[PDB]
Write an enzyme that holds these catalytic residues in place. Structure first.
Site, PDB file in Angstrom:
ATOM      1  N   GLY A 110       0.831  -1.188   0.000  1.00  0.00           N
ATOM      2  CA  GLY A 110       0.000   0.000   0.000  1.00  0.00           C
ATOM      3  C   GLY A 110       0.867   1.240   0.000  1.00  0.00           C
ATOM      4  O   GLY A 110       1.574   1.499   0.977  1.00  0.00           O
ATOM      5  N   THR A 111       0.834   2.014  -1.080  1.00  0.00           N
ATOM      6  CA  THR A 111       1.810   3.080  -1.263  1.00  0.00           C
ATOM      7  C   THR A 111       1.236   4.141  -2.194  1.00  0.00           C
ATOM      8  O   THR A 111       0.087   4.059  -2.635  1.00  0.00           O
ATOM      9  CB  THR A 111       3.126   2.521  -1.812  1.00  0.00           C
ATOM     10  OG1 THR A 111       4.023   3.599  -2.107  1.00  0.00           O
ATOM     11  CG2 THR A 111       2.878   1.710  -3.073  1.00  0.00           C
TER      12      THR A 111
END
Lengths: 234, 241, 250, 254, 142, 205, 210, 245, 245
Positions: free
Chosen positions: F9-10
């Site tokens: 998740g970025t």
């Protein structure tokens, strides 16, 4: 004497640079009877002289049908002829099944060359020993091909292979301009082929038993005449 | 020569020798050219002799010096086909080592790997050794300047300096005398250009008759990169003393 | 110009300078070492007849099986090495039964003969491109006699080279030369079944060293209605006695 | 080595025709697919083929459903000189008209008979295959195959596929010189039971009771046929088979 | 260019799929006695209820090797994978040790596993069979 | 996506500009709602001037990136410096051929003297797309409008830096799985430049 | 999980006469509410005077017909151009269907031709290969509408034996017209192949919905 | 000694002097083939083949002795016909694979290296035979024009001018003279004329012959491989005939 | 000549010499004899004289039971016979498992011949130097069966047959003294005939003779030394009485 030391297999060169097993395989063609092929801009025909074991036996099949638009005639070993004819049948079937396409004669010649070259550079097998004459009709018209088991294919207007085929080849060379223009008349082309193969006869006469004919063309599917079907051409 | 077998495969003779290995060794001098490898303070220099008797050849395509990785260079003595085969396998070995162990392949480890492959060739009946001699040069991050040599028998060893070719004895004697005089196992210079000039001078005084810029090939390994010099660079080095 | 030794006749995949394979020739020579088998094809059936060479009188009479049943409409006679003929017969039986299983019909005699020849080709590349299966060609020759609706009564000769011929009459084995000459002289298209049987017995008697009787000779026939059958010793003995009486009539 | 080179030289992969089995199944290289003595069966290439087959075999078109053999009563017994096999020929109508009467008993050989009692396709296919195996065995051994051997062949074959989805219960009935008259029952679970009297069908208790009421080893041929017909009639026209050492003889409604 | 092995499931089955153990009495059926597997193991049971990781583990190294060969073909040419495969095949074919199952030293050098250990190395592992002659027949193809 | 695995998740951005390309990302790794790694370098180098950022399964993308770096080293040993298109093709082949078993998405940024800076994106599934700029990750969804309103072709280096900083700051502000510092790599003909920006700087934008 | 099957919704009918056979089918191809095509033949001439139809999932039927035609080609190659009889074709199709026992074709198959005595013959196949010879067989949607219509006007026990080919064609057309009127999946066309000693003849008739 | 007895019956065997005699026998097989030449000009390459006339039965357009490996790569060979066909097929496969993978025509040195590795791999085992062909190939890429010659040992080099076959000595002498007389370089049309002249001069063996020529130049053929039309071929033949007589 | 170095080579006269050499190896083994009676089979074997320090209680016998109704004797290499016998026993049990019926004598003979033939089909294997005699009764059958198998894979059916060393003399004796029209009708007559046949070659007498008797319903009996001694003494007494007259 020195040839006797360097002809063991197909992976050996002689000190002069000669591959003798392939040469012997090429020489094996002369042991078969004569076949003639020729063509014009519309049709292609094959004529074959068949041999029997003796009076009580049947005659050998010299012409084999590969597909509705392509066929061939043999001169040489029987096993290699069977193998190559079955391989060509499989390739034509694959083309038709996968692409709904008619296999081209040039493609068949290339495939035969590729399959034949392999046996002349690896140990454990032998080169093929049969010459083939391939006639066909495709989108480029009529085609005649000569396959030599060293792995070579040539495209010609006419040719002959087998024992004493030089006379038929000379006759075809002399009269090229005549039969090259026989368009729309299959009978004239077939008769020209019969006359050409008559030059290679030695103490022999063409009969309904020893003569086999094949034809392919624009509206003519590859058809083989045997027996009484050739009586009109004698 | 070999009496019965031992003329085809690598098995022991009555004298306890492997004739095919020795013949592969003799095959390494076919090209009749020499190469020299020396170490500086922070560089390693390999210099090979170019012979182009044919006037129809393109000189820029004739080379026996190969780049294996970012830091390793290789020089081959012997026929060029086996040289290129060995070069490709060495490139694959260095890349696979980097992938598998997470850091760059050292020169000595690559030399050991190639030597182990050569041992395979010397022991298997249906495999022949490559008639080449390989010399790897680099500046290892732990060992500093490094020269390692491998031969068709599977033997490898490192050198303070080395020479190989039909005239390797003269260059070896000259290098040994120089190192006796200087009492240092390397060259005390701060730039690789001086080391290249020293190697050229050594080659000239050993072989004799000198040469122009087109008869030589020079490869230099630093701590970051191994690179081959071009004809103009060699001309500058020849001019500069 | 010196006399050295040639070695082109030892490998099955080696050509002679003129393009011949001598191992096939030597396999035919091995065939000629076997006993004699004669087949005659007529319009009323096909007759097969073999000579039983018993080396010792202690050998069981009903043990030499030179005539076998491939299928109800196909019979075979063999000459040469029996071990190879065993494998060939097993393959032919399997092919016939499989054709019946998949097509619900009898297989053509020529199709079965072609399958046997394709098997015989296996010392080299197969007919469909298969890899080599055996190290040498077979040392047996087969006479395959059958009847089908397409071509009537047929007699085929199958050889280790992978090639088969259709014959009106054919003899194989040790005494094949004189027998084949007699067949060339004495075959015609209007033969009956009993005349064919008598001719087979006469030629076997001519080409056999021992005195012909019911114990060293065997007869069989294939017909459309009765299928393939092998005559018992009593019927063959009666035929031999009739042949003797006919010979003694003149 | 050249074959190795060909393997690494660059359409066929997507067609999956580099596999010999795919070429054989589509009849590219020849008719070798119709030449296998042991037929090759396609299985879904997933983790749970059995669950897949079971889920998709129980879901709309009546003509696309797997045909199931009639559960009608089938009877077999052995009295003194053969086997009486009795079935009821009350066929079930559908969206079709039959050219001739159907048969609930498969004629494996002139000497062997079987019953379907399960999946129709499984019984027909595998009993034809069994007939082929028996023919090959008889050709090899020059003697009629024993009924025990044939039933064992069928049982081994069905056991090799146990749990895959097959369903078939058959009664192999035969008569040989060495064994006498013999009846075996072979199921798709691998069961193989030798017996004297077998009754398998929708209502078979009535037929079994009628048989047990008047069963003896000294029955005659006509008496045995009459008893079998009466047992079938009690169960629920009637096709009869009498098996003797020389083969089976079929009686339409005797 | 595969990382996890793919296409591991069978697509066809038959009773003669195992050519090594076939009945001589009925050549179309397998020989239960000479299989020596407990005698109650039909082939169908092997088609269901397998551990999901088993196929991944069994074909892992072959898949990595094939990816390496494909990369060599893409970057170097046909000759490099051809030569690697030829070397491996020669080494594997010339080795016949019926009394041991360990891989050769040269095979480990070619595989670049001279100083590597996996659980296959640590864990390399009747009435009928398991003799030298069975291995001879399997090796020679007779 | 296997249970108990680690997901990426970025917020990933890659922008082409006048002199080259810039690749930027955040530095947060979270397992659920817990920030497992507060300071992460997400800018992965597969060649001297070919960098990438990863999304999806961390293990799968790490394995794919290792294989790609190995492949590019082999290519360099044979033919020299590869183009960004070649690296993108290798990434696409790896992601597509294994998509039934691995969950990987890649943003590739590169520079070479022929093509002069390029961006490729390979979303989940294995398709490849070449774009003047790309955004990816869970936090990218909140800046689809802003970027579409503020990107210009052939921007200067400083304008590109400001654009990436603003966009990633907004993505950090709105996405829970994103935060920490902003990292940027500038790939031009003059070399490789590294930039880092701290929360006390970009949160005031 | 991926579902490899589908349904295309056709209707076929085979009738065996005294010296002829008839195989007819509707020419509409649909996907469960939509019309994919209004003319898509499903009855095919396979050579040697054999007509075949595989109704149901269209991909499976196409695959089965393709495989059968290739097998017939090899049969001609390997047996000196021998004519393939109808019973042999039925056995070949049984083996082709049962070869997929554990992953079956989702089709109902009917073939028609002439037996060795010259009489008409029709064979019907279950999806896994079970087959039988029948005088008349209706398959697919609206078979329950077509069979009673035929039984109302023909005594299969005017007797069917003495019917001519034209009368059979008219009766098939009438039954299909009624089925088209009563069934939403039947319509848009009817195609009939007739097998006699002279070969295979084709007839087409437009149905409702154009 | 040209004949090494005891070391010339297996492919991968070293002689006591370190020589491989089967490769040398393949070289001798090459030296009996038809004469082929290649010339490198300022911006391209020219290939010339001395074809031997055959029967009139040959279809004139279906028998070409210069093979097109790719749109920018053309080759000729001398030796065994099947070996040459096999090597041309391998080269076509390599070029196609490279263009598919890297979306550009393969550079000539990369093609040369791949072909050379393939040839060299056939000197390693006793179950294969060295190729009995020598190949002259070349073309144009982003770096310019390249001409290479490849030998049965797997050894290949780049050349200013290359010659193979029976008439290799005279052709090599003429190529050396041409290189010496043009230190600056050469043009494509002059190269074609000189190639015709050299092919005509090299012929020394009662048998009539024809000539095939092929171009690949940036200025003349836009960096593509082309054959010679009637006008240029006739002009080159006239120049060669003037040179001979 | 040069035709006996492999199993895959035909000689010009159509022979395979390695098969004959395997037969030569068989010829050196101890003699074995088999006599088929009206309702029994008798297998006799010659044993080399036991050494003084040899333990004559655990060494394997010359006649091995393949199953409860079939027996096998051999002649030739003793170690290969163990392999063949083990394979035969495994095959008998496998056939019982697969078809619920024990093998027939001919089926087992064919299996043994098949193994021997299969060991002649490779250049890397050696054929078994063994010839075998297989005797028994088919299950629920009363016809005695006797077969001979050879190293090449050929098997034959005999009423009386001898293999091994000096088997020609025994075969001539059997031909003189055995007629198929009137086979010996009792076990005693068959055993006496077998003993007298073996006494023509056996140097010492009753201590170099082993006899096994097979009778229907799977009755396999190995005679003790005392019974063989009684038979030998009776034969010697009859011979002495005949010579005295």
């Amino acid at each position: 004497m020195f040839r006797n030391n360097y002809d063991g297999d197909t992976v050996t060169f002689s000190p002069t640079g000669r591959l003798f097993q392939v040469e012997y395989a090429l020489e094996a063609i002369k042991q078969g009877s004569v076949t003639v092929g020729l063509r014009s801009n519309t049709h292609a025909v094959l004529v074959a002289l068949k041999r029997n074991a003796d009076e009580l036996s049947s005659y050998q099949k010299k012409i084999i049908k590969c597909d509705e638009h392509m066929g061939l005639s043999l001169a040489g070993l029987a096993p290699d002829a069977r193998v190559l004819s079955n391989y060509l049948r499989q390739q034509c079937n694959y083309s038709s099944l996968v692409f709904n396409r008619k296999l081209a004669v040039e493609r068949a010649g290339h495939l035969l060359c590729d399959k034949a070259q392999k046996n002349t550079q690896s140990y454990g097998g032998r080169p093929y020993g049969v010459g083939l004459l391939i006639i066909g009709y495709d989108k480029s018209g009529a085609h005649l091909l000569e396959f030599q088991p060293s792995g070579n294919v040539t495209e010609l207007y006419g040719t002959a292979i087998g024992a004493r085929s030089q006379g038929a080849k000379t006759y075809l060379e002399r009269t090229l301009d005549t039969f090259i223009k026989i368009d729309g008349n299959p009978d004239e082309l077939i008769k020209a082929g019969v006359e050409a193969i008559s030059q290679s006869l030695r103490d022999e006469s063409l009969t309904v038993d020893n003569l086999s004919i094949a034809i392919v063309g624009k509206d003519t599917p590859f058809t083989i005449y045997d027996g009484e079907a050739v009586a009109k051409y004698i | 020569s070999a009496a019965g077998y031992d003329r085809h495969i690598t098995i022991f003779s009555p004298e306890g020798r492997l004739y095919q290995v020795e013949y592969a060794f003799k095959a390494t001098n076919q090209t009749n050219i020499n190469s020299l490898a020396v170490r500086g303070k922070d560089c390693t220099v390999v210099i090979s002799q170019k012979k182009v008797p044919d006037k129809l050849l393109d000189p820029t395509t004739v080379s026996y010096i190969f780049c294996i990785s970012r830091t390793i260079g290789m020089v081959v003595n012997g026929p060029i086909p086996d040289a290129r085969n060995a070069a490709l396998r060495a490139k694959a070995e260095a890349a696979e080592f980097r992938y598998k162990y997470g850091y760059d392949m050292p020169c000595d480890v690559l030399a050991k790997r190639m030597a182990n492959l050569s041992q395979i060739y010397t022991q298997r009946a249906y495999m022949r050794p490559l008639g080449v001699i390989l010399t790897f040069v680099s500046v290892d991050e732990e060992l500093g300047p490094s020269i390692y040599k491998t031969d068709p028998a599977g033997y490898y060893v490192g050198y303070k300096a080395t020479a190989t070719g039909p005239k390797q004895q003269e260059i070896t004697t000259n290098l040994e005398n120089h190192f006796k005089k200087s009492k240092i196992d390397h060259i005390n210079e701060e730039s690789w250009e001086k080391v290249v000039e020293f190697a050229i001078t050594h080659m000239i005084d050993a072989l004799g008759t000198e040469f122009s810029k087109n008869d030589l090939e020079v490869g230099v390994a630093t701590k970051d990169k191994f690179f081959t010099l071009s004809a103009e660079n060699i001309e500058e080095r020849l001019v500069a003393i | 110009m010196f006399l050295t030794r040639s070695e082109y006749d030892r490998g099955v995949s080696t050509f002679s300078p003129e393009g011949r394979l001598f191992q096939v020739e030597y396999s035919l020579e091995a065939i000629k070492l076997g006993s004699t088998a004669i087949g005659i094809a007529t319009k009323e059936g096909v007759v097969l007849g073999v000579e039983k060479r018993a080396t010792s009188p202690l050998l069981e009479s009903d043990s030499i099986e030179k005539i076998v049943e491939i299928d109800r409409h196909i019979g075979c006679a063999m000459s040469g090495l029996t071990a190879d003929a065993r494998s060939m017969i097993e393959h032919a039986r399997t092919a016939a039964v499989t054709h019946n299983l998949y097509y619900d019909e009898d297989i053509n005699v020529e199709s079965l003969t072609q399958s046997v020849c394709d098997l015989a080709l296996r010392f080299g590349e197969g007919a469909s491109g298969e890899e080599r299966l055996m190290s040498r060609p077979f040392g047996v020759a087969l006479l395959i006699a059958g009847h089908d609706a397409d071509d009537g009564y047929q007699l085929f000769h199958a050889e280790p080279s992978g090639t088969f011929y259709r014959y009106n009459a054919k003899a194989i084995g040790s005494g094949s030369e004189g027998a084949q000459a007699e067949l060339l002289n004495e075959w015609h298209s209007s033969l009956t079944l009993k005349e064919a049987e008598l001719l087979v017995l006469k030629i076997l008697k001519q080409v056999m060293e021992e005195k012909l009787d019911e114990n060293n000779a065997q007869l069989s026939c294939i017909t459309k209605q009765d299928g393939f059958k092998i005559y018992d010793n009593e019927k063959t003995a009666e035929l031999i006695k009739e042949l003797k009486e006919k010979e003694a009539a003149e | 080595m050249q074959a190795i080179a060909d393997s690494f030289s660059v359409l066929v992969k997507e067609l999956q025709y580099d596999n010999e089995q795919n070429l054989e199944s589509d009849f590219v290289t020849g008719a070798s697919q119709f030449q296998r003595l042991a037929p090759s069966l396609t299985v879904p290439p997933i983790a749970s083929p059995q669950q897949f087959l079971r889920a998709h075999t129980d879901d709309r078109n009546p003509d696309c459903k797997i045909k199931i053999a009639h559960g009608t009563t089938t009877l077999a017994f052995r009295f003194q000189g053969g086997i009486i096999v009795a079935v009821d020929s009350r066929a079930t109508a559908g969206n079709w008209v039959a050219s001739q009467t159907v048969k609930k008993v498969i004629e494996i050989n002139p000497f062997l008979l079987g019953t379907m009692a399960g999946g129709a396709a499984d019984c027909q296919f595998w009993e034809t295959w069994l007939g082929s195996q028996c023919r090959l065995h008889e050709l090899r051994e020059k003697e009629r195959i024993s009924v025990a051997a044939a039933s064992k062949i069928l049982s081994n074959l069905v056991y090799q596929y146990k749990g895959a989805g097959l369903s078939m219960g058959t009664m192999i009935c035969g008569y040989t010189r060495k064994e006498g008259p013999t009846i075996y029952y072979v199921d798709s679970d691998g069961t193989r039971l030798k017996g004297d009297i077998f009754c398998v069908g929708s209502g078979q208790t009535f037929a079994y009771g009628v048989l047990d009421s008047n069963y003896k080893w000294d029955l005659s041929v006509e008496d045995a046929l009459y008893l079998g017909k009466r047992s079938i009639l009690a169960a629920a026209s009637v096709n009869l088979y009498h098996v003797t050492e020389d083969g089976w003889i079929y009686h339409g409604n005797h | 260019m595969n990382i996890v092995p793919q296409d591991t499931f069978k697509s066809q089955v038959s009773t003669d799929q195992d050519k090594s153990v076939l009945s001589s009495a009925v050549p179309s059926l397998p020989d239960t006695l000479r299989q020596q597997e407990g005698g109650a193991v039909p082939l169908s049971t092997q088609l269901n209820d397998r551990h999901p990781l088993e196929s991944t583990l069994k074909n892992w190294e072959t898949t990595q090797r094939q990816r390496q060969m494909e990369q060599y073909r893409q970057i170097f040419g046909i000759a490099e994978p051809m030569k690697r495969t030829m070397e491996m095949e020669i080494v594997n074919r010339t080795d016949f040790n019926p009394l041991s199952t360990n891989g050769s030293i040269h095979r480990d050098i070619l595989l670049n596993k001279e100083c590597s250990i996996d659980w296959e190395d640590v864990y390399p592992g009747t009435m009928v069979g398991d003799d030298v002659h069975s291995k001879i027949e399997k090796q020679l193809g007779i | 996506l296997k249970k108990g695995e680690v997901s990426l998740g970025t917020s990933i951005m890659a922008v082409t500009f006048k002199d080259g390309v810039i690749l930027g990302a955040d530095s947060r790794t979270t397992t659920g709602a817990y920030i497992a790694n507060r300071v992460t370098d997400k800018l992965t180098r597969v060649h001297d001037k070919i960098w990438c950022c990863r999304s999806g399964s961390a293990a799968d993308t790490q394995a794919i990136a290792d294989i790609v770096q190995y492949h590019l080293e082999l290519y360099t040993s044979q033919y020299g410096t590869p183009s960004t298109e070649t690296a993108a093709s290798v990434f696409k082949e790896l992601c597509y051929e294994n998509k039934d078993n691995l969950t990987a998405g890649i943003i590739v940024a590169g520079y070479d003297d022929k093509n002069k800076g390029e961006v490729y994106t390979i979303p989940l599934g294995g398709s490849v797309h070449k774009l003047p700029y790309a955004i990816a990750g869970s936090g990218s969804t909140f800046i689809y409008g802003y970027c579409d309103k503020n990107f210009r072709e052939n921007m200067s280096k400083e304008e590109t830096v400001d654009f990436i900083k603003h966009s990633l700051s907004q993505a950090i502000k709105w996405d829970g799985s994103s935060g920490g510092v902003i990292r940027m790599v500038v790939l031009t003909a003059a070399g490789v430049e590294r930039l880092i920006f701290y929360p006390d700087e970009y949160e005031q934008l | 999980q991926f579902n490899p099957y589908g349904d295309n919704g056709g209707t076929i009918l085979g009738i065996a006469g005294e010296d002829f056979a008839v195989l007819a089918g509707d020419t509409r191809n649909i996907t469960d509410y939509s019309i994919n095509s209004r003319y898509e033949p499903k009855v095919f001439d396979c050579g040697d005077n054999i007509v075949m139809s595989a109704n149901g999932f269209a991909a499976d039927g196409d695959a089965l017909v393709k495989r059968f035609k290739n097998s017939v080609k090899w049969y001609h190659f390997d047996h000196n151009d021998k004519k393939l009889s109808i019973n042999s074709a039925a056995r070949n199709i049984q083996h082709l269907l049962y070869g997929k026992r554990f992953f079956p074709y989702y089709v109902h198959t009917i073939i028609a031709g002439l037996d060795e005595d010259g009489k008409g013959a029709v064979y019907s196949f279950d999806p896994v290969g079970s087959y039988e010879r029948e005088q008349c067989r209706a398959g697919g949607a609206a078979a329950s509408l077509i069979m009673p219509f035929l039984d109302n006007q023909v005594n299969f026990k005017k007797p069917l034996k003495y019917l001519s080919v034209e009368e059979v064609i008219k009766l098939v057309r009438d039954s299909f017209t009624s089925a088209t009127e009563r069934h939403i999946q039947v319509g848009d066309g009817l195609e009939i192949l007739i097998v006699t000693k002279d070969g295979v003849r084709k007839e087409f008739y437009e149905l409702k919905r154009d | 000694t040209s004949i090494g007895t005891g070391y010339d019956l297996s492919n991968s065997v070293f002689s006591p002097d370190g020589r491989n005699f089967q490769v040398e026998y393949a070289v001798k097989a090459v030296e009996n083939g038809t004469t082929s030449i290649g010339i490198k000009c300022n911006d391209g390459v020219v290939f010339a083949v001395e074809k031997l006339i055959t029967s009139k039965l040959l279809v004139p357009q279906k028998n070409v002795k210069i093979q097109v490996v790719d749109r920018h790569i053309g080759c000729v060979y001398s030796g065994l016909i099947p070996d040459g066909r096999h090597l041309v097929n391998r080269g076509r496969e390599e070029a196609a694979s490279f263009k598919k993978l890297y979306k550009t025509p393969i550079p000539i040195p990369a093609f040369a290296d791949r072909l050379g590795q393939y040839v060299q791999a056939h000197t390693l085992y006793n179950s294969v035979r060295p190729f009995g062909v020598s190949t002259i190939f070349g073309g144009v890429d982003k770096n310019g024009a390249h001409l290479y010659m490849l030998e049965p040992s797997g050894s290949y080099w780049g050349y200013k001018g290359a010659a193979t076959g029976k008439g290799r000595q005279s052709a090599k002498a003429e190529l050396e003279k041409l290189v010496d007389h043009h230190p600056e370089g050469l043009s494509a049309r002059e190269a074609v004329k000189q190639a015709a002249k050299i092919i005509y001069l090299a012929h020394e063996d009662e048998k009539d012959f024809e000539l095939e020529i092929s171009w690949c130049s940036l200025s003349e053929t836009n960096g593509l491989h082309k054959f010679v039309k009637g006008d240029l071929l006739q002009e080159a033949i006239d120049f060669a005939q003037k040179e001979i007589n | 000549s040069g035709y006996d170095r492999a199993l895959s080579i035909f000689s010009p006269d159509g022979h395979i010499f390695q098969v004959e050499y395997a037969l030569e190896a068989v010829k050196r083994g101890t003699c074995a004899v088999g006599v088929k009676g009206k309702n029994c089979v008798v297998l006799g074997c010659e044993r080399r004289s036991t050494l003084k320090l040899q333990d004559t209680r655990i060494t394997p016998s010359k006649v091995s039971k393949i199953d409860s109704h079939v027996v096998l004797s051999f002649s030739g290499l003793n170690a290969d016979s163990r392999i063949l016998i083990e394979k035969a026993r495994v095959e008998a049990q496998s056939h019982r498992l697969t078809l619920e019926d024990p093998v027939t004598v001919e089926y087992l003979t064919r299996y043994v011949a098949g193994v021997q033939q299969r060991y002649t089909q490779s250049g890397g294997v050696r054929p078994f130097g063994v010839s075998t005699l297989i005797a028994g009764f088919d299950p629920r059958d009363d016809e005695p069966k006797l077969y001979q198998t050879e190293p090449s894979g050929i098997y034959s059916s005999w009423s009386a047959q001898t293999i091994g060393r000096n088997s020609k003399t025994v075969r001539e004796f059997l031909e003189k003294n055995y007629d198929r029209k009137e086979p010996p009708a009792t076990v005693e007559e068959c055993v006496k005939l077998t003993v007298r046949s073996l006494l023509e070659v056996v140097q010492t007498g009753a201590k170099n003779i082993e006899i096994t008797v097979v009778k229907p319903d799977s009755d396999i009996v190995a005679l003790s030394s005392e019974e063989i001694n009684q038979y030998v003494t009776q034969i010697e007494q009859e011979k002495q009485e005949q010579q005295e007259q």
